[PDB]
Amino acid sequence: DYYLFLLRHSSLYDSFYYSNYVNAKLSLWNENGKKRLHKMFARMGIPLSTAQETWLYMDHSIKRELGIIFDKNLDRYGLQDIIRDGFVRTLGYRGSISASEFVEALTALLEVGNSAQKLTNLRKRWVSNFWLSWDALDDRKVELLNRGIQLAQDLQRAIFNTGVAILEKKLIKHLRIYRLCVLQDGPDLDLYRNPLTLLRLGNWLIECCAESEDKQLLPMVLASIDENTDTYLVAGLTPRYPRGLDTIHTKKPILNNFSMAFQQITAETDAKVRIDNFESSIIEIRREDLSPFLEKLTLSGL
Amino acid sequence: EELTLESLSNVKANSYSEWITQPNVSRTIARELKSFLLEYTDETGRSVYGARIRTLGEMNSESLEVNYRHLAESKAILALFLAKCPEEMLKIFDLVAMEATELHYPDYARIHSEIHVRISDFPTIYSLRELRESNLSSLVRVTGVVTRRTGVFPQLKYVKFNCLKCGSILGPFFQDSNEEIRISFCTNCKSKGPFRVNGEKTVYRNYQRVTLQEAPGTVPPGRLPRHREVILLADLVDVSKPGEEVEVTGIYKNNYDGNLNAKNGFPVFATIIEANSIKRREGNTANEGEEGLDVFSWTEEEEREFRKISRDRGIIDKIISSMAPSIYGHRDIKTAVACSLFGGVPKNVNGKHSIRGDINVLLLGDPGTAKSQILKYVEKTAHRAVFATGQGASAVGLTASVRKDPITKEWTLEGGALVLADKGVCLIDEFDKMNDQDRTSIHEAMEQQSISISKAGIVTTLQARCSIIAAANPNGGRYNSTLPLAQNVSLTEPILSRFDILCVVRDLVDEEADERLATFVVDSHVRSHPENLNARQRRLQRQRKKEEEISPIPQELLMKYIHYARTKIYPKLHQMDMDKVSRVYADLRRESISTGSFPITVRHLESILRIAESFAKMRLSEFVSSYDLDRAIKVVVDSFVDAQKVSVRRQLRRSFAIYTLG
Amino acid sequence: NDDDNTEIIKSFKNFILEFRLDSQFIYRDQLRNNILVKNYSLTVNMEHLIGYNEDIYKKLSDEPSDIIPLFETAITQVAKRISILSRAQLLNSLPTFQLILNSNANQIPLRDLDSEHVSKIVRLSGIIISTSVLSSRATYLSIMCRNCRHTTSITINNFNSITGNTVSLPRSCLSKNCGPDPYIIIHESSKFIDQQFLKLQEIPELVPVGEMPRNLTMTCDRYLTNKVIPGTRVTIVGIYSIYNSKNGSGVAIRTPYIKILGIQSDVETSSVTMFTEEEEEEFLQLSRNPKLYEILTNSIAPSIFGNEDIKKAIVCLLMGGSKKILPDGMRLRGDINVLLLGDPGTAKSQLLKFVEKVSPIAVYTSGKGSSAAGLTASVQRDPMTREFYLEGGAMVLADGGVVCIDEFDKMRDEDRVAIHEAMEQQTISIAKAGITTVLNSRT
DNA sequence: AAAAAAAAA
Ligand SMILES: Nc1ncnc2c1ncn2[C@@H]1O[C@H](COP(=O)(O)OP(=O)(O)OP(=O)(O)O)[C@@H](O)[C@H]1O
């Protein structure tokens, strides 16, 4: 199997387009990335109109020869790390599924499904979504998995649409210690109230930043807005090494000091925060209180 | 075998056709052709055909364009062979092109098995009247007007037969799109008998034939046009459209016919033209800036230059100043025309709401103000341009019309003027003198962007994405500054409201403005005088020197820039001042009819937004900044202010100075 | 030759008899329910066929016209197996079963069809503009001779895969000294099915730049006929094949056409009640809502701001009145008319297109580009036989629905008087070229 | 032979 987004349920073109690793390696957010992708397809020999078809109806000959085509074409452009070995589950005549696709569907179904009062309502909706995802586990239900797959596709589209705008507007401010980015305004901001959706967006941004020529490993701070509450949901993210690296420079994973910094600043200043999430690196802060807090985080020992 | 180019100078056979196909010379031709399209360098020192091959691979198209003058300047003997005997040369050229394409893209044959090569522009040009017997079986270049198009049908390419008298399967045979395959003795058995096609193992092409007339601008006055038949093979289908003047490079051929001999009493032969390349020549008659089938297409380096020049400061000012470099003053008109021809983004909300994304411009003013010259320049500029005028256009002429086909004898639909203006501009002159019945038929065109016909049992709706630019003159021939706009023109509110930008040009008396204008006019007149390495490039650099003194950027580069900006970049509108624009709209709702006569509606709000989107498009940027909104609001408020009575213009000018503060 | 056909038929029979998910053999019960209601047809979902085995799908995609009759005879074999008792050994009035396919492949626009789609399965969408009158097709012909004078029977299928496909008459007799083809057709004791022709037009929003819409011809038979009415958006699954025209420019030309295998329609030909029980319950539940009026009023053009009484009038118009009849025969109108007469810029035209989209049957036309003869009834003549016949316009096309007319004032005075009777009595009368017909149009 | 659309008088 390959590091591809729903390969067996979407077209091969959409899979290559929305795959995060290929996005990072080929800079698909501008037009040169699309030109290089069309170069990829032309050199492999798959017709564009053929590659824009569903995997079920896509041609049997190239389905059989896909492995050899990849092995012979992907060496030039540095994508040879996409090939891996995965687990495939088949039960009856319903079809075949893979672990990566299953976990993507589960995560999407967790994300989307169905002051203090509205916070409680949001947490209750999250609990209900958890129950729905739990119920979807059994093999007797597949309308609760097709919906998850389509929701995963929609959420990945939305994340890509927001990330390209962030990258082109260059909102990533580079400080001396850590990078900072704040989503002040935009479309569909109401989706990012979910911590897992925010983490997905941050993971894509981290991959995009790591797949660059910069030689600085700095933590990234991401914030959002929910106008009904007038609060900033801030998440701290650790840097990541490129997936194509040896194990010698992997003595220990990068540690996360954001929770410690947050708790120290909260214990020394009277900020109107609410640190209650199980993930200690995700906090809720006030719009008026963010900026001084940030300054403190800048001036404190990390 | 002495496979040398100098050995091709002298012929040994009786003619070219039988000599080209000789095995010894064919391989020499192939190797020389390969060396040509693999080694030819451009003025910059790069293999242009390599970039052509890469672009062909990216677009997975079927045609590779080879410039004729490139082949003529180097290895001219091959050019002569191709010009005199095209059939025996194009096949070798196709084979070598396929090999060259496979060189860059191995296993490319899976996408397509064969490639068709195209000739850009032959040196000699003929008309339909100047056709003789000497120029047969050779390339011809004919301009004309497409009148009747047959359609799309498939044809056999590799024909095989199964003869059941002996169980003999004939090998694959060709077809020349105008002759039936006829075999006499049927292979080894050497006899004639029953046979069938057995078309389960065959390959198909598609063809389209069309009737070509003479251009009305080329025919001598008061005479009749000459008709010919044009045959289009694969990849040429539906490229040409009815009513669109075209220029076709093709091969002249003749064949036998029965009733032509029957009615004439002499062995006369019918003639048809097998097309090889098509170039559109509708509107834009200026055909000297650059060469190629399509002048609105760009290479990769031209795209890189576009991106490089799209990031400098004040590029909008340079673009505005580079439009009509021989017309003095009228900065507002230039800005309005640029914003109109760059256009906006059509909006679709949930598939159930539609918002128009094009800008209309109305020009009104005194005579001798170069409105017609600006309209002509716009026609020369846009990719699609249609020119109408005064009483010379009818209501059903601009709109699609209903006609009965004389052959099949039933009602059909004929494309109107506006349909040709789809994705383009429709230019109207003398807008005031056009009759009201011929004026009230474009409301859907300006607003709904759709044309609906319910005539003679035919119910269909036609799309029309056209931007209308109009010019007119006020009542009495001059503009009365001390009168409202309602008493200046005879138009009504429904037609006036649909124009996003309305400009008024006043001819006044000034001592130094007249002197400056006269100096500019005299300098222009003395500049365009016909009397002031290769001579062609010397003339081209003379043209560049002439043009650089009034144009900040070359015109053809601007042409491709316009095309690229209209093609790819789509602005996005997120961070705009809700309160500022809302209060500006509220203020324009104030005054207006409550104090004067100019009508203002919600359409002007969308007009401001479209102008802001256009200004974003100017910079090749995907997102609207604040400066674009400021410029759009400044333009709109200026256009609104300068159309009031001189009594209150100063008061409104000082009143509305708080929103366009800058 | 025959062994491969038997192997393929056996494979399809094994598929239909064996396909079960969980605890139900769906296709066998489908056959039972179809036979019990005299609907000798079966529907195959393509994904199930792909999942069961890939070789059969490959063979079907390679040569559809040859393969399909084998499947459609395996179906009738299985039906006779699982419906009729042998009784240790009759009517047997079961014809060849019709096969209907469904799929979820990528759509192909009409203008993108080229020489590479010959004899392939394709899926596309369009708009229906005209329906031909039904015709008869023979399936089992009784053939009689003249000189030797014996009896014979000919079995013919509807799939051709080629232009000819036709065995007209055998050469020589069946074994004295008869003619080349001394046969006739016994019309009695023969079996016939029904065929219909349709014209499809490209969807307006996918028309390329500066071009006109293109038409195409489709052919359907048996249960697929009489399903679609003019003016209905449809999705078609069929085969793109070519047929010669010896009667009819160029050399070796062949006019392409589409053979219909499956039709999907949004209206589903509902307009007697055919809705599902769950849908009926949902409709009753919605009608039980205490504030359905405000919910529907908000639903009319949500992107239009401010208008309320206009939206209420639109809802009342779309719902429609109640038709009545009287003992003496007088009719009473049952529709409501709304006229919008206001200043420019008040979004008058944006409501018309939304009302057209919502209504199941609606047409949108302008008062400028229209004519009195082009709306009610157009009298045409056939170029071949030279006979007068009546062709409907736009008002008759929207019978039983609504008609959207904008720019009502620009309409010619001569044209605007024809609608007077067409709305005051909902019946139009034509007296042209000796034709005296009273035509119905309710809208 | 008879109905229906278009431009000029
Ligand atoms: N700066 C200028 N402003 C106006 N006219 C100019 C200017 N420079 C040159 N001209 C000349 O003035 C003439 C204006 O053209 P033209 O007479 O068509 O104007 P117009 O008022 O638009 O005409 P009409 O409305 O009668 O068609 C042209 O011959 C043009 O060469």
Ligand SMILES: Nc1ncnc2c1ncn2[C@@H]1O[C@H](COP(=O)(O)OP(=O)(O)OP(=O)(O)O)[C@@H](O)[C@H]1O
């Ligand atoms: N109440 C409204 N809410 C939102 N948009 C509106 C409203 N009224 C007008 N508009 C906007 O006005 C624009 C033009 O509207 P439209 O063309 O439908 O008006 P109209 O009344 O039919 O005009 P006309 O009488 O000139 O044909 C559209 O873009 C539409 O969105």
Ligand SMILES: [Mg+2]
């Ligand atoms: Mg309107």
Ligand SMILES: [Zn+2]
């Ligand atoms: Zn023989």
Ligand SMILES: [Zn+2]
């Ligand atoms: Zn006999």
